[PDB]
Amino acid sequence: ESADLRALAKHLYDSYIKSFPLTKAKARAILTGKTTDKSPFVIYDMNSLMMGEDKIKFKHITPLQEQSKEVAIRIFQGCQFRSVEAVQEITEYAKSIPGFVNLDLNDQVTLLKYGVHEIIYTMLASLMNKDGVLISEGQGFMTREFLKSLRKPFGDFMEPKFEFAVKFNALELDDSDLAIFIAVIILSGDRPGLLNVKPIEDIQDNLLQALELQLKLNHPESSQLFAKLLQKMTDLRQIVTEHVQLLQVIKKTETDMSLHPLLQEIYKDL
C-alpha cells in the first residue's frame, strides 16, 4: 500500500500541484466555489475584455489594423495559450514521474507531443464552464459567447471542450485521482511516433495504479472502474483530433492567412 500508494499519490499531485494548480477544486471553486462566490474572472465583458486584451495582451502597438490579428488571433492565441502553456506545465509535473525523464529526451516529448493533448483536455473539461472555460490569468475563464464571437473557425475552440466536459465531468473524481490521470495519458502508452514504448507504457502501469488506486480507495465501488473511466479517452482523444481539425483546416487552409512562425512551429513536430 503506502509504497507508491500514498507516496506516488503525494508525488503525482506534488509535482502536479506545482505545475498546474488549476484543478476541479480550483475550477469548480472559482466557477462558484470561491471568487467571493460570484464567478471566476469572467472574460467576455467589456470590463474583463478590457483588463484582458489589454493586460493578458498589453504591448501590442504596430502597423497592423486594416486586416490583421483578428478577434481570433487574439482569442485563438489565448484560448489556445492555455495549451501551449500546459505543455510547459505538464513537463514541470511530468518529469515528476520516476520514469518519464528516465525515458528519452525525444520520447518524453514525443508522448507529450501527442499526449499533452489528452492531458490538457483531460482535466480541461473539468476546468470548463457551461458558456466559458477556466483560464489561468487573474483566475477567470473564457466564455463561449466570447471565443466563438469571432472568426467562424477560431470562433469555436472551446465550446467543444467545455461541452465534452459537461459529459466528461461525469468521470472526474478528485483532482487527486485526476492529477494522476493526466499522467495515465502523459506516459503516451497510446501515442503514435513513440520511442521507448517499453518504458513509456511501463511508467504508465504505475501512474495507472495510483489512479485506480487513490481512486478505488477514495471511492471503492465496482470493478475496473478506472478501466472504464479511462476509456473516456473517446471524448478525450476526440476533442484533440478536433482542436486540429480547426487549426488543421486553417493551418492548411486558413481564412486568409494571419499566423506567425511561433505557430507554424507549435503545430510542426519536434
Side-chain angles (χ1 to χ4, degrees), residues 19 36-37 41 58 61 87-88 92 118-119 133 149-150 166 168 170 175 187 192 203 209 213 230 235 242 267:
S19 179
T36 232
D37 256 62
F41 156 51
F58 173 71
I61 296 308
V87 162
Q88 335 210 13
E92 262 239 89
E118 273 131 276
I119 267 80
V133 291
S149 270
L150 40 94
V166 139
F168 222 77
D175 313 335
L187 264 303
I203 295 325
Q209 280 169 84
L213 162 129
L230 299 171
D235 326 58
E242 258 163 21
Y267 152 54

PDB file of all heavy atoms in Angstrom, residues 19 36-37 41 58 61 87-88 92 118-119 133 149-150 166 168 170 175 187 192 203 209 213 230 235 242 267:
ATOM      1  N   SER A  19       3.055  22.243 -11.074  1.00  0.00           N
ATOM      2  CA  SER A  19       2.911  22.586 -12.478  1.00  0.00           C
ATOM      3  C   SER A  19       1.655  23.435 -12.684  1.00  0.00           C
ATOM      4  O   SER A  19       1.734  24.660 -12.748  1.00  0.00           O
ATOM      5  CB  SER A  19       2.850  21.329 -13.348  1.00  0.00           C
ATOM      6  OG  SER A  19       2.677  21.642 -14.727  1.00  0.00           O
ATOM      7  N   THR A  36     -15.196  34.873  -4.041  1.00  0.00           N
ATOM      8  CA  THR A  36     -16.174  35.648  -3.297  1.00  0.00           C
ATOM      9  C   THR A  36     -17.590  35.156  -3.605  1.00  0.00           C
ATOM     10  O   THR A  36     -18.569  35.828  -3.279  1.00  0.00           O
ATOM     11  CB  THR A  36     -15.958  37.126  -3.631  1.00  0.00           C
ATOM     12  OG1 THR A  36     -15.842  37.756  -2.359  1.00  0.00           O
ATOM     13  CG2 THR A  36     -17.197  37.773  -4.255  1.00  0.00           C
ATOM     14  N   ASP A  37     -17.654  33.989  -4.228  1.00  0.00           N
ATOM     15  CA  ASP A  37     -18.934  33.400  -4.583  1.00  0.00           C
ATOM     16  C   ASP A  37     -19.650  34.311  -5.582  1.00  0.00           C
ATOM     17  O   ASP A  37     -20.618  34.985  -5.230  1.00  0.00           O
ATOM     18  CB  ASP A  37     -19.831  33.249  -3.353  1.00  0.00           C
ATOM     19  CG  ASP A  37     -19.952  31.823  -2.812  1.00  0.00           C
ATOM     20  OD1 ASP A  37     -18.845  31.300  -2.404  1.00  0.00           O
ATOM     21  OD2 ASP A  37     -21.047  31.242  -2.782  1.00  0.00           O
ATOM     22  N   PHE A  41     -12.968  35.368 -12.619  1.00  0.00           N
ATOM     23  CA  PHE A  41     -12.667  36.472 -13.515  1.00  0.00           C
ATOM     24  C   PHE A  41     -13.221  36.206 -14.917  1.00  0.00           C
ATOM     25  O   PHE A  41     -12.473  35.849 -15.826  1.00  0.00           O
ATOM     26  CB  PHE A  41     -11.144  36.582 -13.593  1.00  0.00           C
ATOM     27  CG  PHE A  41     -10.633  37.250 -14.872  1.00  0.00           C
ATOM     28  CD1 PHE A  41     -11.137  38.452 -15.259  1.00  0.00           C
ATOM     29  CD2 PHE A  41      -9.674  36.641 -15.620  1.00  0.00           C
ATOM     30  CE1 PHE A  41     -10.663  39.072 -16.445  1.00  0.00           C
ATOM     31  CE2 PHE A  41      -9.201  37.262 -16.807  1.00  0.00           C
ATOM     32  CZ  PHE A  41      -9.705  38.463 -17.195  1.00  0.00           C
ATOM     33  N   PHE A  58      -1.570  43.441 -23.639  1.00  0.00           N
ATOM     34  CA  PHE A  58      -0.643  44.533 -23.401  1.00  0.00           C
ATOM     35  C   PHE A  58       0.433  44.585 -24.486  1.00  0.00           C
ATOM     36  O   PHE A  58       0.618  43.622 -25.230  1.00  0.00           O
ATOM     37  CB  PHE A  58       0.023  44.269 -22.050  1.00  0.00           C
ATOM     38  CG  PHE A  58       1.156  45.241 -21.713  1.00  0.00           C
ATOM     39  CD1 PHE A  58       0.871  46.533 -21.398  1.00  0.00           C
ATOM     40  CD2 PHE A  58       2.447  44.813 -21.730  1.00  0.00           C
ATOM     41  CE1 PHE A  58       1.923  47.435 -21.086  1.00  0.00           C
ATOM     42  CE2 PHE A  58       3.498  45.716 -21.417  1.00  0.00           C
ATOM     43  CZ  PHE A  58       3.213  47.008 -21.102  1.00  0.00           C
ATOM     44  N   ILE A  61       1.225  47.458 -30.132  1.00  0.00           N
ATOM     45  CA  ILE A  61       1.025  48.610 -30.995  1.00  0.00           C
ATOM     46  C   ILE A  61       1.957  48.504 -32.204  1.00  0.00           C
ATOM     47  O   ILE A  61       3.166  48.692 -32.078  1.00  0.00           O
ATOM     48  CB  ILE A  61       1.190  49.909 -30.203  1.00  0.00           C
ATOM     49  CG1 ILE A  61       0.114  50.032 -29.122  1.00  0.00           C
ATOM     50  CG2 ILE A  61       1.208  51.122 -31.136  1.00  0.00           C
ATOM     51  CD1 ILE A  61      -1.284  49.845 -29.716  1.00  0.00           C
ATOM     52  N   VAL A  87       1.752  22.298 -21.944  1.00  0.00           N
ATOM     53  CA  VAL A  87       2.933  21.593 -22.414  1.00  0.00           C
ATOM     54  C   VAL A  87       4.116  21.928 -21.505  1.00  0.00           C
ATOM     55  O   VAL A  87       4.849  21.035 -21.080  1.00  0.00           O
ATOM     56  CB  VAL A  87       3.194  21.931 -23.884  1.00  0.00           C
ATOM     57  CG1 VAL A  87       4.629  21.580 -24.280  1.00  0.00           C
ATOM     58  CG2 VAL A  87       2.185  21.229 -24.795  1.00  0.00           C
ATOM     59  N   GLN A  88       4.269  23.215 -21.233  1.00  0.00           N
ATOM     60  CA  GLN A  88       5.352  23.678 -20.382  1.00  0.00           C
ATOM     61  C   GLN A  88       5.080  23.300 -18.925  1.00  0.00           C
ATOM     62  O   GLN A  88       6.012  23.091 -18.149  1.00  0.00           O
ATOM     63  CB  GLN A  88       5.556  25.187 -20.527  1.00  0.00           C
ATOM     64  CG  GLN A  88       5.061  25.679 -21.889  1.00  0.00           C
ATOM     65  CD  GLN A  88       5.853  26.902 -22.352  1.00  0.00           C
ATOM     66  OE1 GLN A  88       6.895  27.240 -21.814  1.00  0.00           O
ATOM     67  NE2 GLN A  88       5.305  27.546 -23.378  1.00  0.00           N
ATOM     68  N   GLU A  92       6.922  20.188 -16.155  1.00  0.00           N
ATOM     69  CA  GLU A  92       7.235  20.573 -14.789  1.00  0.00           C
ATOM     70  C   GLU A  92       6.657  19.555 -13.805  1.00  0.00           C
ATOM     71  O   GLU A  92       7.179  19.386 -12.703  1.00  0.00           O
ATOM     72  CB  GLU A  92       6.720  21.982 -14.486  1.00  0.00           C
ATOM     73  CG  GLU A  92       7.837  23.018 -14.635  1.00  0.00           C
ATOM     74  CD  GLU A  92       8.066  23.768 -13.322  1.00  0.00           C
ATOM     75  OE1 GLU A  92       8.875  23.329 -12.491  1.00  0.00           O
ATOM     76  OE2 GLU A  92       7.370  24.844 -13.179  1.00  0.00           O
ATOM     77  N   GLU A 118      -4.333  14.785 -24.651  1.00  0.00           N
ATOM     78  CA  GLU A 118      -5.239  14.053 -23.786  1.00  0.00           C
ATOM     79  C   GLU A 118      -5.013  14.445 -22.325  1.00  0.00           C
ATOM     80  O   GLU A 118      -5.721  13.976 -21.435  1.00  0.00           O
ATOM     81  CB  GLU A 118      -5.082  12.543 -23.978  1.00  0.00           C
ATOM     82  CG  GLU A 118      -5.970  12.039 -25.117  1.00  0.00           C
ATOM     83  CD  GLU A 118      -5.176  11.161 -26.086  1.00  0.00           C
ATOM     84  OE1 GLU A 118      -4.508  11.684 -26.991  1.00  0.00           O
ATOM     85  OE2 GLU A 118      -5.268   9.892 -25.872  1.00  0.00           O
ATOM     86  N   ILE A 119      -4.023  15.302 -22.123  1.00  0.00           N
ATOM     87  CA  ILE A 119      -3.694  15.764 -20.785  1.00  0.00           C
ATOM     88  C   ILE A 119      -4.427  17.078 -20.510  1.00  0.00           C
ATOM     89  O   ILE A 119      -5.238  17.159 -19.588  1.00  0.00           O
ATOM     90  CB  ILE A 119      -2.177  15.857 -20.608  1.00  0.00           C
ATOM     91  CG1 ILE A 119      -1.613  14.562 -20.020  1.00  0.00           C
ATOM     92  CG2 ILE A 119      -1.796  17.081 -19.772  1.00  0.00           C
ATOM     93  CD1 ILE A 119      -1.446  13.494 -21.103  1.00  0.00           C
ATOM     94  N   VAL A 133     -14.671  28.815 -19.940  1.00  0.00           N
ATOM     95  CA  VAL A 133     -13.632  27.866 -19.576  1.00  0.00           C
ATOM     96  C   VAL A 133     -12.626  28.549 -18.648  1.00  0.00           C
ATOM     97  O   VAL A 133     -12.127  29.632 -18.956  1.00  0.00           O
ATOM     98  CB  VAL A 133     -12.986  27.289 -20.837  1.00  0.00           C
ATOM     99  CG1 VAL A 133     -13.964  26.384 -21.589  1.00  0.00           C
ATOM    100  CG2 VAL A 133     -12.463  28.404 -21.746  1.00  0.00           C
ATOM    101  N   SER A 149     -17.548  34.225 -30.496  1.00  0.00           N
ATOM    102  CA  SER A 149     -17.816  35.545 -31.042  1.00  0.00           C
ATOM    103  C   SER A 149     -16.592  36.052 -31.808  1.00  0.00           C
ATOM    104  O   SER A 149     -15.827  36.867 -31.293  1.00  0.00           O
ATOM    105  CB  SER A 149     -18.197  36.531 -29.937  1.00  0.00           C
ATOM    106  OG  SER A 149     -19.604  36.561 -29.710  1.00  0.00           O
ATOM    107  N   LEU A 150     -16.444  35.550 -33.025  1.00  0.00           N
ATOM    108  CA  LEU A 150     -15.326  35.943 -33.866  1.00  0.00           C
ATOM    109  C   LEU A 150     -15.209  34.967 -35.038  1.00  0.00           C
ATOM    110  O   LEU A 150     -16.170  34.278 -35.376  1.00  0.00           O
ATOM    111  CB  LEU A 150     -14.047  36.062 -33.035  1.00  0.00           C
ATOM    112  CG  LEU A 150     -13.844  34.993 -31.959  1.00  0.00           C
ATOM    113  CD1 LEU A 150     -12.999  33.834 -32.491  1.00  0.00           C
ATOM    114  CD2 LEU A 150     -13.246  35.602 -30.689  1.00  0.00           C
ATOM    115  N   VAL A 166     -18.971  18.647 -19.824  1.00  0.00           N
ATOM    116  CA  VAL A 166     -20.301  18.500 -19.260  1.00  0.00           C
ATOM    117  C   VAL A 166     -20.706  17.025 -19.294  1.00  0.00           C
ATOM    118  O   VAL A 166     -21.578  16.600 -18.537  1.00  0.00           O
ATOM    119  CB  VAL A 166     -21.287  19.407 -20.000  1.00  0.00           C
ATOM    120  CG1 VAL A 166     -22.621  18.695 -20.231  1.00  0.00           C
ATOM    121  CG2 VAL A 166     -21.490  20.724 -19.247  1.00  0.00           C
ATOM    122  N   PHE A 168     -18.026  14.718 -19.641  1.00  0.00           N
ATOM    123  CA  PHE A 168     -16.839  14.076 -19.106  1.00  0.00           C
ATOM    124  C   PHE A 168     -16.758  14.253 -17.587  1.00  0.00           C
ATOM    125  O   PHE A 168     -16.301  13.358 -16.878  1.00  0.00           O
ATOM    126  CB  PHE A 168     -15.631  14.759 -19.750  1.00  0.00           C
ATOM    127  CG  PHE A 168     -14.525  13.793 -20.179  1.00  0.00           C
ATOM    128  CD1 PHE A 168     -14.664  13.059 -21.314  1.00  0.00           C
ATOM    129  CD2 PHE A 168     -13.401  13.668 -19.422  1.00  0.00           C
ATOM    130  CE1 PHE A 168     -13.638  12.162 -21.712  1.00  0.00           C
ATOM    131  CE2 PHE A 168     -12.375  12.770 -19.819  1.00  0.00           C
ATOM    132  CZ  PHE A 168     -12.514  12.036 -20.956  1.00  0.00           C
ATOM    133  N   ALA A 170     -18.494  13.689 -15.677  1.00  0.00           N
ATOM    134  CA  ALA A 170     -19.134  12.531 -15.074  1.00  0.00           C
ATOM    135  C   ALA A 170     -18.145  11.365 -15.044  1.00  0.00           C
ATOM    136  O   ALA A 170     -18.534  10.212 -15.227  1.00  0.00           O
ATOM    137  CB  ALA A 170     -20.411  12.193 -15.848  1.00  0.00           C
ATOM    138  N   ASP A 175      -9.302  16.008  -7.931  1.00  0.00           N
ATOM    139  CA  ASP A 175      -8.095  16.442  -8.615  1.00  0.00           C
ATOM    140  C   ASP A 175      -6.986  15.414  -8.382  1.00  0.00           C
ATOM    141  O   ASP A 175      -6.114  15.234  -9.231  1.00  0.00           O
ATOM    142  CB  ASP A 175      -7.612  17.790  -8.078  1.00  0.00           C
ATOM    143  CG  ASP A 175      -8.698  18.859  -7.941  1.00  0.00           C
ATOM    144  OD1 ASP A 175      -9.720  18.824  -8.641  1.00  0.00           O
ATOM    145  OD2 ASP A 175      -8.459  19.768  -7.056  1.00  0.00           O
ATOM    146  N   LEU A 187       2.315   9.368 -20.031  1.00  0.00           N
ATOM    147  CA  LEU A 187       3.172   8.259 -20.418  1.00  0.00           C
ATOM    148  C   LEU A 187       2.651   7.647 -21.719  1.00  0.00           C
ATOM    149  O   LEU A 187       2.415   6.442 -21.792  1.00  0.00           O
ATOM    150  CB  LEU A 187       3.295   7.252 -19.272  1.00  0.00           C
ATOM    151  CG  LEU A 187       4.522   7.409 -18.370  1.00  0.00           C
ATOM    152  CD1 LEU A 187       5.814   7.340 -19.186  1.00  0.00           C
ATOM    153  CD2 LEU A 187       4.434   8.693 -17.543  1.00  0.00           C
ATOM    154  N   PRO A 192       1.279   7.690 -31.230  1.00  0.00           N
ATOM    155  CA  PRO A 192       1.981   7.306 -32.442  1.00  0.00           C
ATOM    156  C   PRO A 192       3.271   8.112 -32.608  1.00  0.00           C
ATOM    157  O   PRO A 192       3.271   9.330 -32.440  1.00  0.00           O
ATOM    158  CB  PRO A 192       0.985   7.542 -33.566  1.00  0.00           C
ATOM    159  CG  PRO A 192      -0.067   8.481 -33.000  1.00  0.00           C
ATOM    160  CD  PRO A 192       0.102   8.515 -31.489  1.00  0.00           C
ATOM    161  N   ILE A 203       5.957   3.155 -17.446  1.00  0.00           N
ATOM    162  CA  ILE A 203       5.802   4.213 -16.463  1.00  0.00           C
ATOM    163  C   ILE A 203       4.313   4.458 -16.212  1.00  0.00           C
ATOM    164  O   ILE A 203       3.934   4.984 -15.167  1.00  0.00           O
ATOM    165  CB  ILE A 203       6.566   5.465 -16.898  1.00  0.00           C
ATOM    166  CG1 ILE A 203       8.074   5.207 -16.925  1.00  0.00           C
ATOM    167  CG2 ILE A 203       6.206   6.663 -16.017  1.00  0.00           C
ATOM    168  CD1 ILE A 203       8.486   4.251 -15.803  1.00  0.00           C
ATOM    169  N   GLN A 209      -1.874   2.681 -11.747  1.00  0.00           N
ATOM    170  CA  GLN A 209      -2.091   2.095 -10.435  1.00  0.00           C
ATOM    171  C   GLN A 209      -2.598   3.155  -9.456  1.00  0.00           C
ATOM    172  O   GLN A 209      -3.652   2.987  -8.844  1.00  0.00           O
ATOM    173  CB  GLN A 209      -0.815   1.433  -9.912  1.00  0.00           C
ATOM    174  CG  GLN A 209      -0.617   0.051 -10.539  1.00  0.00           C
ATOM    175  CD  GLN A 209       0.775  -0.500 -10.225  1.00  0.00           C
ATOM    176  OE1 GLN A 209       1.021  -1.077  -9.179  1.00  0.00           O
ATOM    177  NE2 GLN A 209       1.668  -0.290 -11.187  1.00  0.00           N
ATOM    178  N   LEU A 213      -5.946   3.440  -7.911  1.00  0.00           N
ATOM    179  CA  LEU A 213      -5.537   3.247  -6.530  1.00  0.00           C
ATOM    180  C   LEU A 213      -6.269   4.254  -5.641  1.00  0.00           C
ATOM    181  O   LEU A 213      -7.310   3.940  -5.066  1.00  0.00           O
ATOM    182  CB  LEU A 213      -4.014   3.312  -6.409  1.00  0.00           C
ATOM    183  CG  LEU A 213      -3.462   3.564  -5.004  1.00  0.00           C
ATOM    184  CD1 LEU A 213      -2.385   2.538  -4.645  1.00  0.00           C
ATOM    185  CD2 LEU A 213      -2.955   5.001  -4.863  1.00  0.00           C
ATOM    186  N   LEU A 230     -11.157   5.382 -17.833  1.00  0.00           N
ATOM    187  CA  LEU A 230     -10.095   5.824 -18.721  1.00  0.00           C
ATOM    188  C   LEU A 230     -10.603   5.803 -20.165  1.00  0.00           C
ATOM    189  O   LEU A 230     -10.360   6.738 -20.926  1.00  0.00           O
ATOM    190  CB  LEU A 230      -8.831   4.990 -18.503  1.00  0.00           C
ATOM    191  CG  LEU A 230      -8.213   5.064 -17.105  1.00  0.00           C
ATOM    192  CD1 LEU A 230      -7.102   4.025 -16.941  1.00  0.00           C
ATOM    193  CD2 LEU A 230      -7.723   6.480 -16.796  1.00  0.00           C
ATOM    194  N   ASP A 235     -14.066  10.834 -25.882  1.00  0.00           N
ATOM    195  CA  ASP A 235     -14.354  12.258 -25.888  1.00  0.00           C
ATOM    196  C   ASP A 235     -13.046  13.038 -25.744  1.00  0.00           C
ATOM    197  O   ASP A 235     -12.961  14.195 -26.155  1.00  0.00           O
ATOM    198  CB  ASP A 235     -15.264  12.641 -24.719  1.00  0.00           C
ATOM    199  CG  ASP A 235     -16.286  11.576 -24.319  1.00  0.00           C
ATOM    200  OD1 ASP A 235     -15.924  10.439 -23.979  1.00  0.00           O
ATOM    201  OD2 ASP A 235     -17.518  11.956 -24.368  1.00  0.00           O
ATOM    202  N   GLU A 242     -10.008  17.183 -32.952  1.00  0.00           N
ATOM    203  CA  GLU A 242     -10.824  18.327 -33.321  1.00  0.00           C
ATOM    204  C   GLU A 242      -9.996  19.612 -33.258  1.00  0.00           C
ATOM    205  O   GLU A 242      -9.939  20.366 -34.227  1.00  0.00           O
ATOM    206  CB  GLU A 242     -12.062  18.429 -32.427  1.00  0.00           C
ATOM    207  CG  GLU A 242     -13.304  17.905 -33.149  1.00  0.00           C
ATOM    208  CD  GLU A 242     -14.428  17.602 -32.158  1.00  0.00           C
ATOM    209  OE1 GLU A 242     -14.426  18.131 -31.037  1.00  0.00           O
ATOM    210  OE2 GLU A 242     -15.330  16.785 -32.588  1.00  0.00           O
ATOM    211  N   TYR A 267       2.633  23.623 -34.220  1.00  0.00           N
ATOM    212  CA  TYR A 267       1.983  22.570 -34.981  1.00  0.00           C
ATOM    213  C   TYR A 267       2.998  21.528 -35.455  1.00  0.00           C
ATOM    214  O   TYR A 267       2.811  20.331 -35.241  1.00  0.00           O
ATOM    215  CB  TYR A 267       1.363  23.254 -36.202  1.00  0.00           C
ATOM    216  CG  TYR A 267       1.229  22.341 -37.423  1.00  0.00           C
ATOM    217  CD1 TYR A 267       0.569  21.134 -37.314  1.00  0.00           C
ATOM    218  CD2 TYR A 267       1.767  22.727 -38.634  1.00  0.00           C
ATOM    219  CE1 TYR A 267       0.443  20.277 -38.464  1.00  0.00           C
ATOM    220  CE2 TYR A 267       1.640  21.869 -39.784  1.00  0.00           C
ATOM    221  CZ  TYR A 267       0.984  20.686 -39.642  1.00  0.00           C
ATOM    222  OH  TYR A 267       0.865  19.876 -40.727  1.00  0.00           O
TER     223      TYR A 267
END
